[PDB]
Scaffold this active site. Sequence first.
Site, PDB file in Angstrom:
ATOM      1  N   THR F   1      10.998  22.763  41.915  1.00  0.00           N
ATOM      2  CA  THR F   1      11.106  21.468  42.408  1.00  0.00           C
ATOM      3  C   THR F   1      11.524  21.164  43.809  1.00  0.00           C
ATOM      4  O   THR F   1      12.715  21.246  43.655  1.00  0.00           O
ATOM      5  CB  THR F   1      11.243  20.379  41.527  1.00  0.00           C
ATOM      6  OG1 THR F   1      10.288  20.332  40.327  1.00  0.00           O
ATOM      7  CG2 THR F   1      11.252  19.011  41.932  1.00  0.00           C
ATOM      8  N   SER F   2      10.616  21.182  44.987  1.00  0.00           N
ATOM      9  CA  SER F   2      11.325  20.750  46.223  1.00  0.00           C
ATOM     10  C   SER F   2      10.034  20.041  46.787  1.00  0.00           C
ATOM     11  O   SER F   2       8.975  20.342  46.673  1.00  0.00           O
ATOM     12  CB  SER F   2      11.514  22.117  46.905  1.00  0.00           C
ATOM     13  OG  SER F   2      12.145  21.613  47.789  1.00  0.00           O
ATOM     14  N   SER F 129      15.219  20.282  43.234  1.00  0.00           N
ATOM     15  CA  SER F 129      16.074  21.462  42.914  1.00  0.00           C
ATOM     16  C   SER F 129      16.292  22.126  44.481  1.00  0.00           C
ATOM     17  O   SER F 129      17.457  22.480  44.586  1.00  0.00           O
ATOM     18  CB  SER F 129      15.265  22.568  42.224  1.00  0.00           C
ATOM     19  OG  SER F 129      15.261  21.982  40.724  1.00  0.00           O
ATOM     20  N   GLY F 130      15.386  22.302  45.171  1.00  0.00           N
ATOM     21  CA  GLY F 130      15.275  23.023  46.424  1.00  0.00           C
ATOM     22  C   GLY F 130      15.769  22.437  47.559  1.00  0.00           C
ATOM     23  O   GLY F 130      15.998  22.989  48.655  1.00  0.00           O
ATOM     24  N   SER F 168      11.836  28.358  40.927  1.00  0.00           N
ATOM     25  CA  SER F 168      10.998  27.196  40.161  1.00  0.00           C
ATOM     26  C   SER F 168      10.383  26.405  41.247  1.00  0.00           C
ATOM     27  O   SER F 168       9.622  25.561  41.194  1.00  0.00           O
ATOM     28  CB  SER F 168      11.994  26.417  39.551  1.00  0.00           C
ATOM     29  OG  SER F 168      12.507  26.985  38.455  1.00  0.00           O
TER      30      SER F 168
END
Lengths: 226, 212, 229, 222, 196, 196, 204, 195, 195
Positions: F1-2, F129-130, F168
């Site tokens: 997830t980014s 996340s990223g 991910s």
Amino acid sequence: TTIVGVKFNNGVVIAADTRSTQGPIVADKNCAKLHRISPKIWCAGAGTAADTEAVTQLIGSNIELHSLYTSREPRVVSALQMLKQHLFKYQGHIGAYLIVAGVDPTGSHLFSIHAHGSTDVGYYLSLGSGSLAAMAVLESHWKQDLTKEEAIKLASDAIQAGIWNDLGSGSNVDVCVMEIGKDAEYLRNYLTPNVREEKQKSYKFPRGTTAVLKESIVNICDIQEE
Amino acid sequence: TTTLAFRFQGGIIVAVDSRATAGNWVASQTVKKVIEINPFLLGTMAGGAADCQFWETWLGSQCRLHELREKERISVAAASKILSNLVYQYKGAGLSMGTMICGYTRKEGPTIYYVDSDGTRLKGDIFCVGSGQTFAYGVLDSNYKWDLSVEDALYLGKRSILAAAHRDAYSGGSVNLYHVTEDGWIYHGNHDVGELFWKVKEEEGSFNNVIG
Amino acid sequence: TQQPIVTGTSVISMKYDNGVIIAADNLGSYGSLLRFNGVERLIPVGDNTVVGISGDISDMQHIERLLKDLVTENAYDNPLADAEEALEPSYIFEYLATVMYQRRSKMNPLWNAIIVAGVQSNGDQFLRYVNLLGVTYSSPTLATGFGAHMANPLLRKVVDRESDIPKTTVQVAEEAIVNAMRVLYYRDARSSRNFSLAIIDKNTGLTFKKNLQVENMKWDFAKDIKGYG
Amino acid sequence: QFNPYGDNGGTILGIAGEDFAVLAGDTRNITDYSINSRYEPKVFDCGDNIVMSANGFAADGDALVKRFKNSVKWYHFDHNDKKLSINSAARNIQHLLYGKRFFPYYVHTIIAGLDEDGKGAVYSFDPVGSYEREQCRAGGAAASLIMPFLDNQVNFKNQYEPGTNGKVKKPLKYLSVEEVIKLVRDSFTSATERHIQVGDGLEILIVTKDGVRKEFYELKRD
Amino acid sequence: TSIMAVTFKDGVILGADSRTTTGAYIANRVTDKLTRVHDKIWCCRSGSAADTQAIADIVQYHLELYTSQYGTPSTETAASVFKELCYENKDNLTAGIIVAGYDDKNKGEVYTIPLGGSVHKLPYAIAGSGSTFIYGYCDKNFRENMSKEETVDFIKHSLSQAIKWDGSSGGVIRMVVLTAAGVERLIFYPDEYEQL
Amino acid sequence: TSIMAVTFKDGVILGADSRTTTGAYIANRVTDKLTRVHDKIWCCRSGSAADTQAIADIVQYHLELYTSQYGTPSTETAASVFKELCYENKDNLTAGIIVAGYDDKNKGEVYTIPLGGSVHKLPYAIAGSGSTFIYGYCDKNFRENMSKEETVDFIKHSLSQAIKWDGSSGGVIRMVVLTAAGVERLIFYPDEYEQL
Amino acid sequence: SDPSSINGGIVVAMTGKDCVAIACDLRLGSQSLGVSNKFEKIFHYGHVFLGITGLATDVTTLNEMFRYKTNLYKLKEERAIEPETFTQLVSSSLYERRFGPYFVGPVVAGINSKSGKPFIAGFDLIGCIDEAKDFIVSGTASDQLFGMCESLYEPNLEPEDLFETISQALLNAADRDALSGWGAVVYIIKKDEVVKRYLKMRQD
Amino acid sequence: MDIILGIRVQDSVILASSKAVTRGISVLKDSDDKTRQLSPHTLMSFAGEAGDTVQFAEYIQANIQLYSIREDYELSPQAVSSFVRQELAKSIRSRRPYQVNVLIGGYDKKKNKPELYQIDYLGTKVELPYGAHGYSGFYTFSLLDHHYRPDMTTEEGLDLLKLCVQELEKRMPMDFKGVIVKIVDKDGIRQVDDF
Amino acid sequence: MDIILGIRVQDSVILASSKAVTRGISVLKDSDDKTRQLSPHTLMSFAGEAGDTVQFAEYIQANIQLYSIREDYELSPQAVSSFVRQELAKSIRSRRPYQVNVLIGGYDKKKNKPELYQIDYLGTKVELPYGAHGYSGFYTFSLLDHHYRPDMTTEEGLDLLKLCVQELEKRMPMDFKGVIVKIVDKDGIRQVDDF
């Protein structure tokens, strides 16, 4: 609890207030923070009183033994290691927090030790609840190469600030000026802010105001020879 | 706290202490644990002080409305039951009440209903509610008879508190004696328990467990 | 139940002889991550009041919007009003406090600590504090959180009591605030280099000095030490 | 999880004499060892020579007063300006605290004034709700620290006449107004040393038939 | 407290942020972190200052005794000694130690020992809390066998980002350049590096 | 997830990955999260997919009504309606929503709505996340009023490093180009930018 | 909470001039149940008096222990323990068991043999020297006596003016505390004579 | 429950011990002794935890026996009581506690006076005319102070005892299946079987 | 307290119901019988938690009375017991349950039949020869299984009852302080001469 240490060329000055409290109840209006490891290495204790007392005795015997064996007063760097390695053993159950300051031939030294054996080095430090308040005085007025006079007045100033905003800080400040190669000058109660005003109306009562059931006389002296 | 009540032929003797402790310390020794719901009824603050006070101030209203409407004296039964219903329904509100509603009618005779925060309503001849109930019961039971004389009942009420007061930590204060007569309750003075201890000590030769 | 997510920091302020001064750095931190490094936490309402809001940014905008409406509400009915029943720092203050305690009573506060600074219609200086539990006091010097412990003691050296208020000139007060903010940057991490300054003076109105910088950083002590080596 | 109820320290003291009543208190306002406010009053006039401080959690007390002010306005309006009684106020206050019983308010409240007889009179409230007429009652966490002094300087409890050694108790003696103010100063001065709640200022509002007098003394800051 | 060590042609340059924090309070901003356990094996410390110290002081005694009885300690060999203590004290202590060294024979070498304890030889390494921000930066700007002047510049830059987005990271970037020449300390204030 | 958006001269370019994982399993690698709420106001979704998806439908219908009665919504208007629902329900619903939309008068506008729920206009925005991984890389590389092609490249450069650091993040880099031209899709395979 | 609060009970000591007072209540109760009206709390090993509060088993086991250690001392040193020496010993011994601690508050009191000074000291749970000459107060009602004594305090009193003061303080404090009541005993030590006084109190 | 009640009269100690032994919901047996004789003039009655008391009361019995033989002198109640207190300070700090409450009523045969010790499980020894355990003492400590005076003979004590036991069964839901009465005096240990 | 018993014999239903009211560790009352007369031919005894006991019992009483009067017809005992089961089946799903065990004895006047229904707390109603509630009941279920015969007269029903009473008092540490036994039969409700 407000304790500060500040370096100068000729030594190091460490001062603390002696209002000690056990809960919000002022336990003691004079109860010196300031412990002796050795006659030129003095330290102040924060955290629990019992914790600081027990520890200061243990290491102060240890240093003494070392001092004799080597026939030279040990380094202030010996004392830092010694505190640290002990406290590590209990894994910080015993929570003793000290500012350790001293002078020795190596020079003048200022160290911290905490419960779990965390240290901090620095020319100037302060510790306890009112540490934040003291640090504040110290960042504005510090100067490269403070002189004896300047550093003593600044250290006592920082305490006075602590007194006002931190309420376990009150009462008289004891100061130990530790000068390299010369007897530590204890300037006991350098600043006293206190005022005591006696009872306006006398509260003495005539005798036999108080009711008694029976009286008795006892002895603690050894029994008679004859 | 120690509060007690006994019915006999002459009516009811109600006797209470005055101590009220908050935390480990004596907060007060003047909280009067007699609540005059009206001239006919005595209620006790035993149990939760505040809950008792608040809800018997309430009970005063219900008695008054009844008296107005039917124009005759309320049964002890009717008033205690009204209280009982109110307190069951609200329970789980930090309620802790424990009260003896004391009254002397001819409708029913001397009548005591112990009401409780759960909502329990229990009749009895003799009730004793308190931390120190336990002490009180020893002296109370052994001089308790229905045909006990009136005069002896007055003494008994003072003695029962004297005893509890002495052993229990949460009891001291002073003695309030009340007699619930036919016509309503009558106040029979305040008597300091502290002082009574010494008179009694001298008079019977009691209080010998006690030094000297 | 509101719990802190996005965070704010200390606000320092003081009374002086002809007005008051409030200052605060410009941060909207998300914890350790200093996400937003310029979210202006001082919100002026007119020249009369500047309301310093610390704690959550989310609730800073909730209240910001309530104030925007409050200005309009005041202006409705008897609009020739301008200094009569027109808003005062106290009007504003009272409103916030009452809402705040009702929010706390539903066990779900707006999670902020707030200092209202400003000048009344009388000219009297106003400084009054209110926070999420609903602790209300006024004091010649006021600071929150980290400021409470560190920038409050220096303020007190000056305005030790009521009588010292007149002696403190707006110039000393100005030195005092500015010097103090440097200290907070040195030894708190939250505190940024950028800060804003607002002066409510009865004579000069609002003087709002933005984007001042903290300099004269101390590394003179940094270079002395090398520790164990 | 938000703190359900604060504490803001402080000590107050209501004393019922036989012609005056004082409500005393410090001005020191605290949370932990920090002084939140050095000067901030706490005794408030409620009118008709009734003083009030709801000491402890400051926010609960502000609420309590705030509502009571409104009630004083509607008591007079409907009753043709009947002088709001001391007892009437008391019953009122009980009823505010009992209002939420489930999460009770956390204030230890004292109202002082004159009863209608005309003696000084003090009524005291425990937070649980209950109230009763009292002689001398200190409030707060140092309520217990102050009370023994008063029970050995005026009440003469556990004092007996010199030379009887207990036969004849030393009877109550009525004190002037002045005498009580000194006593109040000394109690509070001693507590500045022995407790961190009391200090800054001792502000006393004294309520008589003759009106309201205000008395102020500084206490230390250490 | 972000820390790193980065290889260059002539060896390895360690840099480190110098703060020691208690909470949001900066407990000390002139604390020493690039700590000598041997002559040209020096280490960057993150985690609890107390825990890591305990490990480091035990190892420092080991490596002196290693050198006299069993000749020169390798970086790999030294990482092994550190690894044993970390591994056994994996739950008991949280210690993240970058042990880095310069051998004249093997030029710059970096070993990262994470909290669980393991010898992982890597060209260059980033640790502390700020590592993340500059994970992506550093990967793109990885040159092999860098010029010395550049290497100094590169670290300054990487850590410069770290300090803006995380308050813990901060204070002086102290460095020790470990090359054939010896041990050279460098010091760089935020006045010099923060702008850039 | 980014997920990200970056303004430029002529508007704004919305970028996202598309790999969404449940535990270690990749549940769907081609997940769409550029969701049209308005013709030229789109949103980027991260957090809980369930919750952001519900939110986005509610806002969507609201902006249709606003268009019809009160005239066209601007990017600011949208940001408020997203905020208000996010705020009252900050605790029940997890939401990291970037509302970006393009006015010809104000070029590209980017507003990030964090979990707490507040409107903050930024020249560029990162989340998921990223974003931790690229936080410093993007600041170093930020350039205001850049060419449209440089904008494409940047998104690609930064996200490749997100995939490396985060497993991910990944799958097709989808884009919605908002400029006055209209709405244009670009799709860029891993195969291209990972090796680049 | 602490087991020392379940049995209550207090010790208080004050200084005079070349004379000391040390007094206690004789109530030991276990919450509601008053058990004894005569349970002593002040004990003596010669002239160094040892007052002990708290947890009841702990009192007895430690009195016997401190008996044990000063008995060794008197034979070794061939001379009476001093007030001073005793203080230091008590503290050390409470820290010995840091974990599984002692749940007591002892008070050391005495008149120095060689210096003639009246001395008092206090200790926490795990033991520390607490100097404060005016009073050392202990037990559940420790706050009551802190304030009470300090308002009444007037320095270095004669034996007879001292007796009154400590009596007045013990008496009102006790009645304002639930767990303290029933009888009292006061040791007025003139210099080395001990007059031993049971006070009358209105027992409830 | 399982009461042990004691009162000390002018010239002896009278100890009451319940017959009933309850191992929970069921009375597992309703007649069985609850006391053991430590010395010919010293008696120790016991109540507390299940089966712990069984073990403890027998080990305590042997220790005293051993000593007694050694010195050829039965240990006085004083000595007996302190011995037991000692053991309990160890026990309450033990890894596994042994919480037994005791009354030791003994005849101090070296002064010719009865002596009654109350020792609770923590270990505190106090000499008293009366002491008890359970919910026995919270009703009786007061009733006993009233009616008792130092001059009371033993015979009187027994009549009072009946009345004391009677209240207890009444105001506590428990029932003790009465008490066996054992009198410890100068003559040694004698049975009172009327009860 | 924890005991309520019932036995349905040849020509009657016999109920025995505890007199003890114990509210904690003190017996506040030792006499009051925990029963409410629903009809001259129907008796309900009851036990359970504090407060719920009195509210419920009286609420049921009111409802049966209202019913009785409305139509001038005494509802069958079968109907009465169903009534109670439903009110309880509601309670247990509600906000606040009513935890009361009841024995419902009624002598059906018309079918000249004794009928005893055991409704335990849940709202499990069963019609049995004989029943009880609580832990107490276990002890006595054996004496009833063995000695019961249908042909037991009312009088023989009393005899067996005394023997059950005796056993209950022996092995329960808590005495329920005897029972008030009343007979529900064609005569109506009468209280046994002795008990």
